[PDB]
């Protein structure tokens, strides 16, 4: 297959953020890592001044600013999710800004199990080494001897396999590492001394001590305090050896501290951010001993206020704090000495859009002008909302809960949105905050006799699921229908069935209990939104979870656990089973094109079924026999089937004489997107390339996949090969390595996919670069103008 992939909207979620003197020794810089993008801003008193953005051939998993001796300004260490490590310097000569790679190399190990807690990257305060935790039982050390041509990275064995967190201690003669780990006894904090000469670990300055059962964060307090702060779920402790200081502030009991940042350079104040957007200040009181060093007296935690759910925090200047968020919009807030009428010391200054995570989306023509618009379910928890995107203008409709599915009814002029809100079983389940499902003009509650014939507790967070009918013009929540207790709504479709001239909202729901591996009960509920009221037209009970549903030529095609079922809408308004297909583990995703059905499985890739009108049954037309974990499937056309798998890869299969080979779906295209694709849809935001498929990912990235002809694909592949030899990659990563299909099982180069971002970068290069890129290319000898026209035509698609 021949396909073309571009990004209509670059990733918006903030994966990391650091502050330091990167562009110059004088100005203060904020560096934000957004998956593959790296944004450099200069912190001025007028706000944030963007100074640069660089694309990265990799997912930035670690980003640390450090400055060894002899450097005028900080260097930047980046490790990618594919284990490309690089040390970068920012040089600005005249009016030309460029990022120079000072060091680069791959630190992947042939063997090793990636850690459950993830990749950890730390740098010694004196810049003696870089410590990486990539696999259980090993700790990689990269020496930082600049007067050398080779940085010899080596592994050191860890007696503790499950390390929770790790930092480098301050004010140590030899590089000391303090980490919280777990063993059958519980969680412990321990310290080692990293010996480069012997390449090993020696006894730490202070002995291990038992920490909280849920201790998860380690903070290395700078001088003069020294030591470490262990933050868990119920208490905050401070360790410096003979000195131990614990506090148990009740305020932090209602959530988990997830991020931290150091405000004062001497460690006096820290900013802490938890999972529900609360911002705290951790204080460290000091006492000056007589003719001696200062020592900690106490720890005080005060609730600064409420922000967006922070993935990371960074204090910029004059009380300004940047809150980088994954599940909501990023933010610049101000810390005020005096609280407001609500007792909040945080006032929002600026907000930065974040469409991620895009869990579902639809393409609708609301203005009826022939140009499509994308309505996406973005965010989660209080940060969840609807995003309306047009040609790139974005409008936000806050929901204050998690939206799951969205489907548009043109006849009713409305949207049906499945939403979820967290509630506490405070005696039933009361609330957590006002949201869309609780502030609807009208509301209703499910009254179903089924499932009446599973324990609870006083404190338990439970999901309450609602179907919201939302007007398409004002986007007000016209109606909210609440489903049964412990019932999760997983799928939502809007269609007309059979000979019935009415348009319905069909919801598939599963009875979810934490103790069960898979649901044993579920419902398909058909509502009709008529004259402002949402009545339950029909209700069908199924023995499983209705993961997906589509309309199949006037019939309902549902996925109940591992079965793909086809129902028909009877004259008496009742779904009747027509046929079943059982050869699945779990049919998560369903698509359709005529009589063909593309079934996505949890771990067995894609399957192609065909409905037999003359036989009234299914048949397995083809199956893809490479087992990979699927997140989304799409039918590009009758022949090609696109799919996305959980390791950030896209693959295109084809319906390939002997009957055995005809029943195999050959993976004719492979690509490493670097994004977790949640949703696929057919449509375009604008009105060589045939077709148009928009996909939405977890990082708030919207991408476009189209089909190419053989000649166009050949020309663009030649252009890619010629560009890779001209475009200077940041970190010196090979584009071929970056785009290679990567999985824990197998790794292969990309085939049948054109990186449209690389192609569109061809317009931004200098004229000499353009001319030497197109040299002896293909026919009439192509010049720069022809390829410029081709690339502009390609760009016109989005």
């Amino acid at each position: 297959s021949y396909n073309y992939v571009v990004t209509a909207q670059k990733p918006t979620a903030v994966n990391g953020c650091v502050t330091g003197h990167f562009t110059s020794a004088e100005d203060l810089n904020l560096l934000i890592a957004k998956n593959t993008r790296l944004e450099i801003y200069v912190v001025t008193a007028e706000g944030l001044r963007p100074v640069k953005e660089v694309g990265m051939y990799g997912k930035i998993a670690v980003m640390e600013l450090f400055r060894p001796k002899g450097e005028s300004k900080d260097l930047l260490f980046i490790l990618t999710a594919k284990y490309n490590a690089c040390i970068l310097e920012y040089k600005q000569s005249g009016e030309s800004i460029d990022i120079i790679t000072r060091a680069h190399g791959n630190v992947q190990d042939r063997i090793g199990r990636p850690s459950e807690t993830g990749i950890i990257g730390i740098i010694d305060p004196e810049c003696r080494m870089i410590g990486l935790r990539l696999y259980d039982g090993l700790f990689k050390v990269i020496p930082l001897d600049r007067d050398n041509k080779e940085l010899k990275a080596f592994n050191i064995r860890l007696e503790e396999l499950h390390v929770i967190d790790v930092k480098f201690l301050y004010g140590c003669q030899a590089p000391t590492i303090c980490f919280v780990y777990q063993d059958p006894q519980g969680r412990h904090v321990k310290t080692y001394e990293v010996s480069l000469r012997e390449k090993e670990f020696n006894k730490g300055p202070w002995k291990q001590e038992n920490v909280e059962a849920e201790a998860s964060m380690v903070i290395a307090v700078p001088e003069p305090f020294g030591g470490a702060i262990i933050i868990g779920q119920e208490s905050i402790t401070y360790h410096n050896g003979d000195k131990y200081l614990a506090i148990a502030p009740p305020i932090i009991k209602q959530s988990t501290i997830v991020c931290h940042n150091r405000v004062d350079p001497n460690g006096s104040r820290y900013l802490l951010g938890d999972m529900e957007g609360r911002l705290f200040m951790l204080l460290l009181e000091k006492e000056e001993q007589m003719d001696g060093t200062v020592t900690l007296k106490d720890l005080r935690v005060e609730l600064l206020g409420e922000t967006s759910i922070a993935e990371c925090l960074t204090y910029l200047d004059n009380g300004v704090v940047f809150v980088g968020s994954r599940l909501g919009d990023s933010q610049l807030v101000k810390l005020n000495v005096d609280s407001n009428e609500q007792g909040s010391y945080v006032v929002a200054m600026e907000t930065f859009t974040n469409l991620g995570p895009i869990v579902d989306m639809c393409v609708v023509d609301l203005e009826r002008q022939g140009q499509g618009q994308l309505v996406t379910c973005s965010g989660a928890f209080k940060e969840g909302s609807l995003r309306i995107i047009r040609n790139l203008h974005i409008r936000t409709v806050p929901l204050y809960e998690s939206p799951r599915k969205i489907c548009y009814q043109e006849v009713s002029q409305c949207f049906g949105v499945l939403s979820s809100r967290i509630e506490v079983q405070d005696t039933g389940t009361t609330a957590l905050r006002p949201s869309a499902s609780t502030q609807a003009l009208s509301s209703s509650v499910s009254s179903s006799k089924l499932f009446s014939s599973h324990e609870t507790s006083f404190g338990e967070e439970v999901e309450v699921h609602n179907l919201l009918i939302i007007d398409q013009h004002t986007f007000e929540v016209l109606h909210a229908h609440q489903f049964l207790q412990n019932e999760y709504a997983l799928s939502l479709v809007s269609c007309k069935l059979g000979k019935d001239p009415n348009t319905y909202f069909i919801v598939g729901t599963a009875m979810v209990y934490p103790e069960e591996a898979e649901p044993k009960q579920g419902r398909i509920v058909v509502f009709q939104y008529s004259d402002g009221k949402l009545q339950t037209v029909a209700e069908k009970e199924v023995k499983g979870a209705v993961y997906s549903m589509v309309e199949f030529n006037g019939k309902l095609l549902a996925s109940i656990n591992s079965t793909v079922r086809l129902y028909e809408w009877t004259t008496e308004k009742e779904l009747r089973t027509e046929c079943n297909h059982y050869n699945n583990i779990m049919a998560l995703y369903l698509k359709t094109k005529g009589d063909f059905i593309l079934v996505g499985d949890l771990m067995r890739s894609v399957l192609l079924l065909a409905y037999k009108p003359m036989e009234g049954n299914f048949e397995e037309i083809a199956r893809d026999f490479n087992p990979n974990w699927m997140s989304a499937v799409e039918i590009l056309d009758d022949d090609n089937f696109l799919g996305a798998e959980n390791a950030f890869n896209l693959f295109v299969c084809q319906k390939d004489t002997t009957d055995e080979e005809r029943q195999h779906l050959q993976e004719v295209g492979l690509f490493h997107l670097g994004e977790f694709v949640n949703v696929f849809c057919h449509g375009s935001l604008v009105m060589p390339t045939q077709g148009s498929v928009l996909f939405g990912t977890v990082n708030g990235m919207i991408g476009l996949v189209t089909s190419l002809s053989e000649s166009w694909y050949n020309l663009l592949l030649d252009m890619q090969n010629r560009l890779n030899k001209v475009i200077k990659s940041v970190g010196k990563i090979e584009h071929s390595f970056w785009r290679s299909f990567h999985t824990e099982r197998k790794t292969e180069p990309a085939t049948g996919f054109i990186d449209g971002d690389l192609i569109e970068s061809f317009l931004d290069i200098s004229r000499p670069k353009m001319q030497e890129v197109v040299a002896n290319l293909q026919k009439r000898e192509a010049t720069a103008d022809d390829l410029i026209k081709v690339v502009e035509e390609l760009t016109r698609i989005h």
Binding site: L161, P519, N678
Partner: protein, 353 residues
């Protein structure tokens, strides 16, 4: 959350490829039974089964019928194709099989004083290595595809380099008067090997010390297996419970027992299960397949995590695919059992029993 809908929601919300391993681990942890399936195509007892390296895409099996069959697990499960019979058959029972690092070749040996190196891509015999007695063990060096170890009944553990086959001079790593029953390279340290001997127990050997074993754990051992990281040894003994050793301790870290388990009348094999090898699998003479969980806190572990029933005769070989959390077991009967936490076409049983 143990339910799968919670896992799907979390994965779609965070999009990290680390919730999959947690989901599969938690699914296996809560199982009280496994989905059962059969594989047909062998005319006699199956004596050797091996999953292909780096994914378990293929399953190479061999036994009394003298044929080396190569099952495509995905296609075989859906009953789409029949096993590929590699060209080149043994003259007697096949006792051991092995892949190389890449699954580009297959070593097969046993009972005919011969080890045949096949090419799986074209299913053609590539090489032959003669032995003085029946071969029971085959291990391929994890670093070098051209180096492989073999244990024979005469009591010799030899190291062959196929790269210099025509001038056959096997390097004898060990020589004892008793029959060596198992040999395995260390997955992370190729210079270290583990050998199971009929009258000398379990031994740890160095490739640079061709006569003195580094360590002697404990003596009668029929099978010894390293874990994925090569820091533990699981050993099966002629009339004793399975025993787990640390690579350095020399003393039994654990022993595993359960009511009804017995290992006396057939040469069996064991394996580790789970993503971090926290499970012990072993067949028994009562036709059941026992699965224990290695205690996290360190000596007899009584009570199996699972007692998988369904085999009509003694269970000898057990192998585990961690990418799919699949179990392939074989024994005297000519059918190969498949046990999965997930449903497969034409299964039996469930996850609750």
């Amino acid at each position: 959350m143990r339910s799968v809908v919670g896992f799907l929601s979390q994965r779609g919300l965070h999009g990290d490829p680390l919730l999959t391993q947690d989901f599969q681990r938690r699914r296996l942890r809560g199982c009280r039974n496994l989905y059962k399936k059969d594989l047909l195509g062998h005319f006699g007892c199956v004596n050797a089964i091996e999953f292909s390296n780096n994914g378990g895409q293929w399953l190479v099996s061999g036994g009394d019928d003298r044929r080396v069959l190569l099952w495509h697990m995905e296609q075989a499960i859906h009953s789409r194709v029949k096993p590929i019979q590699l060209k080149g058959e043994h003259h007697s029972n096949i006792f051991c099989l092995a892949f190389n690092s890449g699954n580009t070749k297959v070593f097969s040996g046993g009972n005919d004083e011969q080890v045949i190196l096949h090419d799986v891509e074209s299913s053609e015999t590539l090489d032959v290595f003669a032995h003085e007695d029946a071969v029971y063990g085959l291990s391929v060096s994890p670093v070098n595809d051209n180096i492989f170890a073999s244990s024979s009944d005469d009591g010799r553990v030899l190291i062959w380099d196929i790269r210099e086959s025509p001038h056959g001079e096997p390097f004898c790593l060990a020589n004892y008067p008793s029959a060596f029953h198992s040999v395995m390279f260390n997955p992370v340290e190729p210079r270290l090997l583990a050998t199971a001997n009929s009258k000398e127990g379990v031994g740890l050997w160095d490739i640079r010390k061709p006569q003195s074993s580094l360590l002697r754990y404990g003596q009668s051992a029929m099978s010894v297996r390293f874990n994925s990281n090569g820091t533990q040894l699981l050993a099966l003994r002629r009339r004793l419970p399975p025993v787990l050793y640390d690579i350095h301790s020399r003393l039994p870290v654990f022993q595993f027992d359960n009511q009804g388990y017995f290992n006396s009348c057939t040469m069996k094999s064991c394996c580790f299960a789970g993503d971090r090898d926290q499970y012990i699998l072993s067949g028994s003479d009562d036709f059941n397949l026992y699965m224990w969980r290695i205690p996290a806190d360190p000596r007899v572990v009584n009570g199996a995590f699972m007692v998988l029933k369904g085999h009509r005769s003694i269970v000898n070989q057990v192998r585990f695919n961690p990418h799919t959390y699949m179990i392939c077991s074989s024994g005297v009967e000519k059918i190969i059992k498949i046990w999965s936490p997930y449903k497969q076409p034409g299964c039996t049983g469930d996850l609750d029993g």
